[PDB]
């Protein structure tokens, strides 16, 4: 064949830290279908937002929003435990169906997105050019968010361990841990990945007795 229908830009969702995670790559022939299992960002999360995006940028905010829906009724559980199946299905008419199903509860929500939605030909070309021109910056942002997500999880897991230990943790140790947690919390708001990793290292240096507990 000399011609066929494609989806002209990557399609995906916003994930933890404001990144776009792709489900369907740009120039994939249609009809097409792809599913991926996701989970919760924090402990006791009973709802997730499925924010549908079109584009090639690593920052979710830089892509074209196609729509969004919430999936509620998730049984509150530790982060990473729920299995949320997200499915992207584009029919032969270019109509996009996006669904999210929580495997444990069976709860499901879906949205239909019209073929005319999204970016036009000129906006597509500009999206591709802008993604190429900002390739190093988008990769640096992606690396920052991955370090931020680990730091955020370290903040929660350490705070949980401190309350669990209580009296078992000596005063000198708890003091140092709390001081390192504040320094880590501050670094996480910044955009220097090495500064966050360094605060994570400093926290590990004062958490040795908390780890034995």
């Amino acid at each position: 064949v000399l011609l066929l229908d494609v989806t002209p830009l990557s399609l995906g969702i916003e994930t933890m830290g404001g990144v776009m995670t792709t489900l369907i790559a740009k120039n994939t022939t249609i009809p097409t279908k792809h599913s991926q299992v996701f989970s919760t960002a924090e402990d006791n999360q009973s709802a997730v937002t499925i924010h549908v995006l079109q584009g090639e940028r690593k920052r979710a905010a830089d892509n074209k929003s196609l729509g969004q829906f919430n999936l509620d009724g998730i049984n509150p559980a530790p982060r990473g435990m729920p299995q949320i199946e997200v499915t992207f299905d584009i029919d032969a008419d270019g109509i996009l169906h996006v669904s999210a199903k929580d495997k444990n509860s069976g709860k499901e929500q879906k949205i239909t997105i019209k073929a005319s939605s999204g970016l036009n030909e000129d906006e597509i070309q500009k999206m591709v050019r802008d993604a190429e021109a900002n390739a190093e910056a988008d990769r640096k942002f992606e690396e920052l968010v991955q370090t931020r997500n680990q730091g955020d999880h370290l903040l929660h897991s350490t705070r949980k361990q401190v309350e669990e230990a209580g009296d078992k943790l000596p005063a000198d140790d708890k003091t140092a841990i709390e001081s390192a947690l504040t320094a880590l919390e501050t670094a996480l708001k910044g955009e220097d990945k090495a500064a966050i990793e360094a605060k994570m290292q400093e926290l590990a240096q004062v958490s040795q007795k908390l780890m034995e507990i």
Partner: peptide
């Protein structure tokens, strides 16, 4: 391994 979703 699975990627994570926020609650908005």
């Amino acid at each position: 391994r699975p990627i994570l979703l926020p609650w908005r």
